[PDB]
Amino acid sequence: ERKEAERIEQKLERSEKEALESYKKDSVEISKYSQTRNYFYDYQIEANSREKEYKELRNAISKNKIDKPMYVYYFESPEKFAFNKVIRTENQNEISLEKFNEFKETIQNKLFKQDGFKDISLYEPGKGDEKPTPLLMHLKLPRNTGMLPYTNTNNVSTLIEQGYSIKIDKIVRIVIDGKHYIKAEASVVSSLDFKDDVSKGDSWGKANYNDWSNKLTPNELADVNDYMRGGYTAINNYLISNGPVNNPNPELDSKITNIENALKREPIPTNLTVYRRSGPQEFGLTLTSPEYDFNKLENIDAFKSKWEGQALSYPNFISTSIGSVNMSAFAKRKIVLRITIPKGSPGAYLSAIPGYAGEYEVLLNHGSKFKINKIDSYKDGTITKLIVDATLIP
Amino acid sequence: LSPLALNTMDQFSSRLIPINYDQLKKLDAGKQIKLETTQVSGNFGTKN
User: Fold this and answer.
1) Searching chain A, which residue's CA lies closest to the CA of residue B47?
2) A133 shares a domain with A59
3) Which residues form a coiled coil (chain A) (predicted)?
4) By Cβ atoms counted within 10 A, which residue in A116, A170, A173, A303 is the most buried?
């Protein structure tokens, strides 16, 4: 479809032309920068030499869209589907029944999100195409997604940016030119997310939760404000210490019930992802522990082995920051929790109400269960921090 | 400037436009030929 590509490339001005030219010879490093971009401080995200490249590439990708859902196809490494093993090596031909069994059981119900530029195709991988990994996934893009095909010296390939989480229903074994491959069918889940849109996130929060307090009696609003202003380090510690079992008492049970009712009163209308900078003490680890030191690769590997796919829970009141930038108050923490909140789930925006209510603070029900999907790391100066794709379970 | 000349009918401008002997007689009687335009092709420009 070079005719469409030449029709659509003329409307691109010089800036998009240079962005695509820089992409064509340096796709790998631009992409690698694209996955890990938004977790740095508010200063680094404006003082790099590739931030403009990312912005203009996103602009070019979102310049032209698709009017209907259409299927796309590409090769994905199993490492991004919470599989730390290798299914079948490059020189081998066939895959084991066992390896198929663990691979299928590993992705039973787990949603994985991708947030970088990537190369996809609209056709099955026939002859003349390179095959990086034994994994094959047929992806279903929804309506109005970024779609900017570009042409090489002889052939044409397409580039998209992902801001969604994908779920795989079934996997099968197929034979392509004498080798065994795994074929997965996946779908794109709609949601909302603000990687760096501080203004847009603030606007969304104030638009939704400005009318929040209009439905509440003044006494309950005053109680909530007082509790979040003065006793945030008291009730949380009381809940952590297993109060209802050790020392039952109504003076705090009333507070817990009122806060739970207020937080359960209003569910979200649309899926959002919140970022919690979890502390090492939350996972029961201390700064002097060798497993805590994430500078080495083996500690990251061990944490992934023992905590990827495991369940999590927060007996305290959950506080989340919608922003993805590193904050001064939470600078030293290496673990950032990427909680995906689906529609109908508890959660209330506390920054819509006036005053300094915190850092984009959002409160949820105590004792909430969490599901961990994947554990990945990025370079942060000299140290390597930690990201967990938490999921909220009813 | 002077008007342009349209005197060929084929795709490669190599065949002139003929008429009959009776049509020639009608033209010699003082009758006139009327030119009607039916359609016009053309392009527009899209500016980057």
Assistant:
1) A11
2) yes
3) 1-25
4) A303
Q: Which residues of chain B are within 8 Å of residue A18 when distances are taken between CB atoms? A: none
Q: Which DSSP letter does residue A93 get?
A: -
* Domain end position, chosen among A157, A192, A227: A192
Q: Tell me the backbone φ, ψ of residue A327, rounded to 5 degrees.
A: -105, 155
**Closest listed residue to residue A59, CA positions, set A24, A13, A1:** A13
Task: Tell whether A289 and A238 lie within a shared domain.
Answer: yes
Q: Does A12 touch chain B (CB under 8 A)?
A: yes
Dist CA A212 CA A379 (whole Å): 40
Kindly state whether residues A250 and A337 are assigned to the same domain: yes
Residue B48 to chain A, least CA–CA distance (Å)? 5
A11 chain-B contacts, CB cut-off 8 A: 46, 48
Shortest distance between the Cα of A145 and any Cα of chain B, in A, equals 23
Residue A230 tokens, joined:
């003065």
Q: What's the farthest any 2 CA atoms get from each other in chain A?
A: 75
- Please report residues of A whose CB lies closer than 8 A to that of B46: 10-11
Alpha carbon distance A301, A294 (integer Å):
9
Closest CA to A307 of A369, A374, A393: A374
Amino acid A37 reads R
Angle subtended at Cα A264 by Cα A205 and Cα A229, rounded to the nearest 5 degrees: 65
Which of residues A177, A192, A207 is at a domain's end? A192
Residue B44 to chain A, least CA–CA distance (Å): 14
Q: A99 burial class (0-12, 13-18, 19+ CB within 10 angstroms)?
A: middle
A181 and A213 share one domain: no
Q: Which residues of B are less than 8 Å from A13 in CB distance? A: 48
* Residue (of A161, A177, A122, A142) closest to A37 by Cα position: A161
The answer to whether A130 contacts chain B (CB < 8 Å) is no
Look-up: residue for tokens 């939704």? A208
User: Could you list the residue range(s) of the whole structural domain that residue A22 is in?
Assistant: 1-192
